[PDB]
Write a protein that binds this ligand. Structure first.
Ligand SMILES: NC(=O)CN(CC(=O)O)CC(=O)O
Ligand SMILES: NC(=O)CN(CC(=O)O)CC(=O)O
Ligand SMILES: [Cl-]
Ligand SMILES: [Cl-]
Ligand SMILES: [Cl-]
Ligand SMILES: [Cl-]
Ligand code: NA
Ligand code: NA
Ligand code: NA
Ligand code: NA
Lengths: 367, 367, 366, 367
């Protein structure tokens, strides 16, 4: 594994990658050393969200223009866009790049490492079933090794992008005598993320191998580091593993915890603590002093329709889906911790953290 | 002035007032002494929000059934319903009732006092112009006297409910050859709140009497205690003035501060401090120990489209209006402070606190 | 019993004044009102509370102006289909019985109405055989109440059944029961679908289906079922409408099918079957006041196309296809009738063929 | 004037231009002879609709790839994307290309002619004011001359694409000490179309030059052929003038009429008649027999909130804006006439036909 440089840049428009271009010009990182991008785009966050492909193309063109890598090489860089920036959430991209050896001093302290992998092809009949779980788990171990990590406890954040079900793939499944878990395009999104999350939890040894009946139903089964996204651009699981390794060097370190509910700011502080920042007992955003790069977390409205004993009407709201409602709410909860509205807040959290909450990972600048 | 009993009760459904009925049966307060209700309803929060009148009638029926007051006496109790409970916000009602002097300890420490008034009828052509401002100012001054307050500095929170513009009233406006400030019903909600806020600010002597040119344009002109809501429940300004008075007694006290932006949790803590709660200097929701009755605050998306230097896309979002996005966001920010999703968070804050923020008032149980 | 049918506008969410005016003008008697079917201007989904507001305004007129007790009025089936996207005008169709001394009873087929309330439908019943069997029994009850023995004489069955809410899902699980789904919005389609199969069983259009058929076997459907769901009553509100000879009256009902959202000919066919003699290519101006209302279902097809052209309704996370296709068919329908007050209802599982729905028409013949 | 070839092709996805590529390969038309595109995209149709630029880029790249025209020449081809395909409306593009004289039959019958222009740059302070009106009028006169039309009566359809107001452009306006007609981005859509429509009406001599106070208020002033759309694709007015000329030849002819209200199917049939299709009285979609290329029309919710005496609640609906409601409704009304869900139905028709309705143009294949 290599030492990693991590930069979070704003998007000034749906098609803006100029801040990545500026980092390259200022020599903060090298175009060809960019190995992964994880960001938030200002689309609706649902099925018909096309701000993800716009941002995807704007960034790959900067990488192709400013580096010696060929456009075919750039296309292999995993870029994950979580649509939907309700409320104060600021569209942004977190850039992961390798550092040249002559810029790193390797320490025995744990420092940030990144691994990437692509699973075997996921067919429409795999989605949400043990076939998806097993294929994802193998890819997660692959990306884990690529990061130079052997201990699952050193994995703090796993970001994925998996296929959805469409009319075309559903027809494809049935034209070979296969079945699909569901035919609702919106619901397959939660299904794809859920099955992928269980895969992550298996590879990392957080749970025992579950059954087909567990997916979307056994919500006590979950991963504490899984952040799963789905879409249509790819028929494979794209895996990005972010963790720590000793003896690699670098300035950044990752840690994680869990949010037990949408208001659990202490869970976020716990992730920042676990990432290696020493903070006061009751910390405030002003205590961070520039040292928080970003946080990455999931959230969801709980099955019981309550938070801390108080009823809300999210699950009954046919006007604005609870996906967008809870995203905005936790966006404010999270940005109030970090002091920076540029936060990675993502919805659809089946088997991703405890029911009604989600995992939270934090990357900090330690030097 | 009279001692006030303040209770915050949940709404278990759109038409539920059972928790108010139970307070009356348990002798916590008397039906005939309820002088104002301020609550959050689970409607959409815009023009076609009819959960406001459903809750309005369900509560007025408990007051009429369980008290000796006539139904037209009850109809003059100002009941303000702020629709829209996006995110975790829990539908609830804050009930204000008078206590007989024989039951409160008349410390000369400042304790809660409440004043009520109804403006003249506000016609659709009045909305957003000097006619609305002058009518509201008169009602605010009357409600201030009704609270037994002479010094405007003792007013911490002015909650209003004013008519907005609908097709019907716009049609009514034109049926007399009269004009309306705007015919976009959704934006007339911001207009009605703004004109009412300026009314409050003049009555309290925070600003000089403004002109028609200033409404919605001179955003440096604002009140520091105005919380203005608009709706379809009544064609007059329902005024509730809440402040403190010495020598009145009671167990509750109000204070206020300002939120500089949607993430300004410290502004909320400042209001709770100003209300008279001793708190640690890095406070947490667990420090409140049941002593926070509720907080009442306004919020809005800033005109420059940024929070703390970070761009957001609220003002360009044609899918989910920024009213609902920022409400959900600030609901989470606020509920994380109080630890109680039952918070009064209201949107559209023209001339209500500084641009991009709003006032925040807090009522605490001191004993 | 001869039936009087009146369609009245709602001037606001809580307005029942036009029903009060019909009673005052002697057009019909409060206690003879036996069913109401209407459109309310709510969102048409789960959190639509304009249905109970209109429910309250109308029931208060009925018992205020009649000798019926508020407990009897509560037994009058009132069906509110929320969502009036586009030009659709909020309205109520009132069905009342006529006193014998005002009726000229003819052997020509004339309108008859039957009503029933099913057994209690619990959240675990929704979408399963328990819902199907309880609805079927109530439909047969309402059918007998209409004085109809032949199912072919039934042209229109309008229902209102509970959907699933967070409250009812909680109650189901607080008794150790399961629910077909926990997505409240999609439980609307489930409740309509299970109720439609119930209607289809009672009328002998299909054999009794299985739990696995609900929402999946879309070749199974009723040709007269119009099923709506909401949060107004925890039972199936049944209204059976058909024709009977020798009863008298001046209204007659007929029906046909809309094969897709644009099938205006299907609507004209229903008006024809109701007994209006119309030109080959009819226009709204040909109706000459004789169309009381039409009642129809619509839905977005699973294959995402209408007449070979793809649309993006099923992928739209911003505005649900329920509201999109309702507005679209509202325009298609109002263009036929010339009257934006049309009963257009969305979510048509097992209600007509896939991608379409039934359409019933009531006409004034004299 | 050149003879025109008109083809309507479906969009199989947001970024699909393959059907245009197929027309070029099959020799139906020449890449470099494509002079205008008018289409419907499956975005939300409001401010944050980015399916317009996605389709814009996909089409210009086919034009640049398959022709000898330079990319900056292609950029001057007016391509108008009307977002929002609510209901059955099918995403599609109508392609207008010139035909070499040697491929058409010279007839003295009126046949289709097309003219194009780009206006002077329109800044955010221009939108909705006399500056926009005068700039658009000049461009329309240029596009009319480019079509070889001298008599305004020969113009049947003027399609435009103009900038609307966003936070960015509003911030740009204020960063130079300028004002904007409004700061409600969603409302500026109606403003941009309205000001452009008055421009068209001036150039065509349908009205006298209006004042700033007339825009959005004097709805008796309107053009009978203007179809104005706004978005974020270009900061200038893209003008397409479509009419008929004698002695030019070609297969296609255009005509127009007016829709008085959303249900006025006869208005649509009248346009098809005027375009030169001999159809039966009481026509049906089955009478068209493949000869209707497309229809292009405007629609809007009337100011008085009624259609044919019946109240609707479109204008009070804060959940789904009346733009999307009436678009879906008229989409069904229109597609039922044509039998083809691929129809150009456009919303927001200020000064475009009479209030509550809009113009409707039809292009037919006559041979
Ligand atoms: N990719 C997903 O599963 C859910 N995504 C959907 C999207 O990005 O449009 C929303 C999110 O990540 O918060
Ligand atoms: N008319 C407009 O300005 C916007 N358009 C949609 C768009 O292109 O943004 C609405 C329509 O054409 O129906
Ligand atoms: Cl190296
Ligand atoms: Cl350590
Ligand atoms: Cl009798
Ligand atoms: Cl051909
Ligand atoms: Na979770
Ligand atoms: Na403010
Ligand atoms: Na159907
Ligand atoms: Na118009």
């Amino acid at each position: 594994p290599e030492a990693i440089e991590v930069r979070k840049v704003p998007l000034h428009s749906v098609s803006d990658a100029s801040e990545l271009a500026k980092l390259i010009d200022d020599g903060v990182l090298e175009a060809d050393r960019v190995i992964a991008v994880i960001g938030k785009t200002e689309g609706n966050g649902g099925v018909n969200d096309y701000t993800r492909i716009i941002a995807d193309r704007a960034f790959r063109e900067v990488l192709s223009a400013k580096g010696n890598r060929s456009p075919e090489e750039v296309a292999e860089v995993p870029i994950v866009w979580s649509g939907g920036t309700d409320g104060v959430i600021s569209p942004h991209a977190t850039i992961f790049a390798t550092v040249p050896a002559d810029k790193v001093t390797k320490t025995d302290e744990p420092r940030l490492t990144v691994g990437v992998a692509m699973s075997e092809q996921l067919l429409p009949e795999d989605i949400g079933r043990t076939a998806m779980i097993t294929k994802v788990a193998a890819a997660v171990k692959d990306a884990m090794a690529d990061a130079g990590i052997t201990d699952p406890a050193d994995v703090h954040y796993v970001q994925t992008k998996t296929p959805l079900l469409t009319i075309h793939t559903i027809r494809d499944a049935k034209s070979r005598g296969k079945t699909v878990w569901t035919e609702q395009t919106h619901e397959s999104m939660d299904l794809s993320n859920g099955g992928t999350a269980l895969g992550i939890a298996v590879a990392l040894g957080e749970i025992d191998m579950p059954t087909d009946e567990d997916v979307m139903h056994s919500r006590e089964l979950f991963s504490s580091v899984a952040s799963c996204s789905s879409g249509v651009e790819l028929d494979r699981a794209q895996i990005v593993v972010v963790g720590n390794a000793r003896g690699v060097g670098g300035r950044y370190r990752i840690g994680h915890s869990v949010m037990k509910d949408p208001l659990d700011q202490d869970g976020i502080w716990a992730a920042i603590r676990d990432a290696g920042l020493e903070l006061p007992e009751r910390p405030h955003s002003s205590d961070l002093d520039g040292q928080l790069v970003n946080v990455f977390l999931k959230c969801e409205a709980s099955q019981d329709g309550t938070v801390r004993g108080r009823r809300n009407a999210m699950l009954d709201d046919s006007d604005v889906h609870w996906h967008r409602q809870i995203k905005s709410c936790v966006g404010g909860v999270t940005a109030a911790v970090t002091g920076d509205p540029a936060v990675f807040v993502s919805v659809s959290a089946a088997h991703q953290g405890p029911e009604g909450g989600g995992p939270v990972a934090a990357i900090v600048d330690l030097g």
